[PDB]
């Protein structure tokens, strides 16, 4: 079970995600589906929603980063943003359901090695998906294989028109999380920012893509306390790949290269050039984003630059 | 240089102002700790030996701004503090207490005022002698046992060879553990063993002894503001000697030693936040009493130098 202080904390991006066992996390997710009115408006069976949440959990691998606690971080951050940006005045319940279900499903069965590995290694997945966002395409297929199982089918009581619309929105959102598309998806968005229209379908579809993109990579929005161990987990996984890429002679990405990668320099760039501009142009629609998220991103960038100068000092002392 | 009973009491706390005393009384303070800890008693250390050795050690520290005899008094005195604060007499044997104590006193003998990077890049005799491997700490540890090689400084003379081998080994691990080049390696080994620490486990206890000597080594900002701040000045002074000379010779200059780059604020903020605090954080998990006595001054000094840095940046608006 869960406290009423927990249930309140669950709505802000300061929620401490490392406090909870999987069981308590499935209840937090379940609760979001009730509290957002999704159960009510789409006639979701309350036991089918529990089943489905457990159905999702099992299909998540035990990876250092891309695991079931990661998708909880993303789902819980999406939830946080519904309240902080009043999205229930700007979006239909269907769009909310798509945003929260895609956020829960967008890394199903991640294997721990990114698209570049998949392709360069000519994996089954790269071969099945023709080098085209193989992981993200795999994530959707799993999410809908899960929903094709009737007792995991939280959509059982939605009419087929509604299903098709939800399934199409989920596919877009999950496929939009492929970071190779970041500059493209960002450019389309800001272009529409010169005159953003809530009644333009393309515009809403682009705002949702950015919204799930924001949640996916929002660990440094959380308090330094919560954010910091995530970078550790990320580098683990990343070194796990680059080690493989060399027992294999495959190219090695500099940001996974043990010889060139510190915790400071893994974040300093990523905050400055990816996380801040993204939340900036998002703040242009929700000013109250500036205080609650764009702020921890400035203090995070500033801490990690300090850490880099200490790290470098220490790197004089070895390398002889 | 007879110690007053007031001084005996202040000597056991990290608040001890290390600046009042001259080499005479520091020597006396060091002497009291060997008696007070049971080391004179339990290793049959001749008391007159223990006086010559201390002056034997005192001669072999140079007059550097920072790495000098007063620095070695602080490091031994903070160790002494920690034996009482964390009650390490309950956790460690009197040989371990002997290793920790003697290694603190000797850990920087004959320091020249130029770190390992200078020794290596200038290709000095120390670096050539030690094959670029921790040439200072290798040399500190070697002077120590050259001093104990003399019969009139061998405060170990009544220890059976089985014992001497036992102490010499541990002393060497500790002194060479204070090479800051190895900070992350040693801390990481410690955080590993700490996930399920074991006082019965020799490897778990050698890392803990290494953390302790490393803790006391850089413990200056655990002292009160009035005691610590002048150490920051001696530090930049020694460093500024190194980087000035590096410049005259066409040697690389470490940015954190650069006269035209470093402020007292930037010397201390990252060091406290990313080396001192995290290190004492992991010790506090075996010895929670440390949070109150040593984290407490470390958080205060953090914030203090942080506001000092904002003041500096704002004033850099001329
Ligand atoms: C710079 C480095 N840092 C980095 N990657 C992250 C974070 C969160 N998710 N991801 C990955 C992004 C999604 C998977 C985890 C984070 O806080 N930092 C990195 O991996 N970047 C992102 C790319 C990879 O393609 C751009 C270079
Ligand atoms: C600028 C300097 N500040 C700094 N270094 C210290 C202290 C005490 N000993 N040391 C060094 C410890 C070894 C001797 C002096 C202190 O209070 N501040 C710093 O942050 N660094 C990074 C290193 C660690 O190795 C490079 C020195
Ligand atoms: Mg993904
Ligand atoms: Mg030293
Ligand atoms: Zn993700
Ligand atoms: Zn020292």
How far off is chain A from B32, nearest CA to CA, in Å? 36
Token digits for B225? 């503001």
Number of structural domains found in chain A: 1
Contact B193, B204 (CB under 8 A): yes
DSSP letters, chain A, are ---HHHHHHTTSTT--GGG--HHHHHHHHHHHHHHTTHHHHTT--HHHHHHHHHHHHHTS---SSSSHHHHHHHHHHHHHHHHHTTHHHHS-HHHHHHHHHHHHHTTTT--SS-HHHHHHTT-HHHHHTTTSSHHHHHHHHHHHHHHTSGGG-TTTTS-HHHHHHHHHHHHHHHHTT-GGGHHHHHHHHHHHHTT--TT-HHHHHHHHHHHHHHHHT-GGGS-HHHHHHHHHHHHHHHHHHHHHHHHTT----GGG-TTT--HHHHHHHIIIIIIHHHHHHHHTT-TTHHHHTHHHHHHHHHHHHHHHHHHHHHHHHS--
Q: Cα–Cα distances in Å, from A97 out to A36, A88, A90, A163?
A: 9, 11, 13, 11
Residues of A in contact with B181 (CB under 8 A): 314, 317-318
Contact A215, A74 (CB under 8 A): yes
Rounded to the nearest angstrom, the gap between the alpha carbon of residue B93 and the centroid of all alpha carbons in its chain is 21
DSSP 8-state symbol, B199: T
Closest-CA residue to B111 (of B50, B183, B54, B179): B179
Q: What is the dihedral of CA B270, B271, B276, B279, to 10 degrees?
A: 80
Q: Which residues of A carry out catalysis? A: 66
How big is chain B, counted in residues? 318
The Cα–Cα gap between A270 and A291 comes to 20
Report how far ligand 4's centroid is from the alpha carbon of B214 (Å): 9
Name the residue range of residue B163's domain.
1-318
Token digits for B148? 């104990």
How far off is chain B from A284, nearest CA to CA, in Å? 29
Which is the catalytic residue, given B58, B67, B140, B183? B67
DSSP letters, B263-318, are -HHHHHHHHIIIIIHHHHHHHHTT-THHIIIIIHHHHHHHHHHHHHHHHHHHH---
Q: Cα–Cα distances in Å, from B73 out to A138, B13, B41, B147, B217?
A: 64, 13, 22, 18, 10
DSSP 8-state symbol, B93: -
Token digits for B288? 């929670």
Q: Is B107 annotated as a binding residue?
A: yes
Q: Is A239 in the pocket of ligand 1 (CB under 6 A)?
A: no
The Cα–Cα gap between B54 and B50 comes to 6
Token digits for B267? 């010397």
How big is chain A, counted in residues? 320
SS3 B227: helix
Report how far ligand 5's centroid is from the alpha carbon of A109 (Å): 11
Write out the H or E segment, with its range, that includes residue B184: helix B183-194
Report residue B87: phi and psi, to 5°.
Answer: 55, 40
DSSP 8-state symbol, B223: S
DSSP 8-state symbol, B224: -
The phi-psi region of residue B316 (left if phi > 0; otherwise alpha if psi is between -120 and 50; otherwise beta) is: beta
Resolution (A): 2.4
Q: What is the dihedral of CA A65, A70, A74, A79, to 10 degrees?
A: -160
Of the CA atoms within 13 Å of residue B232, those in its CB half-sphere come to 22
Contact B1, B28 (CB under 8 A): yes
The Cα–Cα gap between A3 and B191 comes to 33
SS3 B118: helix
Q: Cα–Cα distances in Å, from B100 out to A255, B105, B167, B180?
A: 41, 9, 10, 18
Experimental method: X-ray
Q: Is A271 in the pocket of ligand 1 (CB under 6 A)?
A: no
Write out the H or E segment, with its range, that includes residue B241: helix B225-249
The Cα–Cα gap between A178 and A197 comes to 25
The Cα–Cα gap between A120 and A253 comes to 12
DSSP 8-state symbol, B20: S
Rounded to the nearest angstrom, the gap between the alpha carbon of residue B304 and the centroid of all alpha carbons in its chain is 23
DSSP letters, B22-72, are -HHHHHHHHHHHHHHTTHHHHTT--HHHHHHHHHHHHHTS---SSSSHHHH
Q: Cα–Cα distances in Å, from A7 out to A16, A163, A219?
A: 12, 30, 20
Contact A279, A294 (CB under 8 A): yes
Report how far ligand 5's centroid is from the alpha carbon of A311 (Å): 28
Q: Which of A307, A309, A317 sits opposite B181 (nearest CB)?
A: A317
Contact B105, B30 (CB under 8 A): yes
The Cα–Cα gap between A23 and A206 comes to 34
């Amino acid at each position: 079970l869960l406290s009423p202080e927990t249930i309140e904390a669950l709505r802000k991006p300061t929620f401490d995600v490392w406090l909870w066992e999987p069981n308590e996390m499935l209840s937090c997710l379940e609760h979001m589906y009730h509290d957002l009115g999704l159960v009510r408006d789409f006639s979701i069976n309350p036991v089918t929603l529990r089943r489905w949440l457990f159905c999702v959990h099992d299909n998540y691998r035990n990876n250092p980063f891309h695991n079931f606690r990661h998708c909880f971080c993303v789902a819980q951050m999406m939830y946080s943003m519904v309240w902080l940006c009043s999205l229930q005045e700007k979006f239909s319940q269907t769009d909310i359901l798509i945003l929260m279900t895609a956020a829960i499903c967008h890394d199903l069965d991640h294997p721990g090695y990114n698209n570049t590995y998949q392709i360069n290694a000519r994996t089954e997945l790269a071969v099945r998906y023709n080098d085209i966002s193989p992981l993200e395409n795999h994530h959707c297929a799993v999410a809908f294989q899960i929903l094709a199982e009737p007792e995991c089918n939280i959509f059982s009581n939605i009419p087929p028109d509604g299903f098709k619309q939800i399934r199409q929105g989920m596919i877009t959102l999950i496929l939009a999380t492929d970071m190779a598309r970041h500059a493209e998806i960002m450019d389309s968005f800001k272009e529409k920012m010169e005159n953003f229209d809530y009644s333009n379908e393309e515009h809403m579809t682009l705002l949702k893509m950015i919204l799930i993109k924001c949640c996916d990579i929002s660990n440094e929005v959380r308090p330094m306390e919560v954010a910091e161990p995530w970078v550790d987990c990320l580098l683990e996984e990343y070194f796990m790949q680059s080690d493989r890429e060399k027992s294999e002679g495959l190219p090695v990405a500099p940001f996974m290269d043990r010889d060139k990668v510190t915790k400071a320099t893994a974040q300093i760039g990523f905050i400055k050039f990816v996380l801040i501009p993204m939340f900036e142009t998002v703040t242009k629609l929700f000013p109250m984003v500036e205080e609650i998220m764009l702020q921890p991103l400035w203090e995070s960038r500033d801490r990690y630059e300090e850490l880099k100068r200490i790290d470098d000092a220490m790197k004089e002392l070895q390398k002889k």
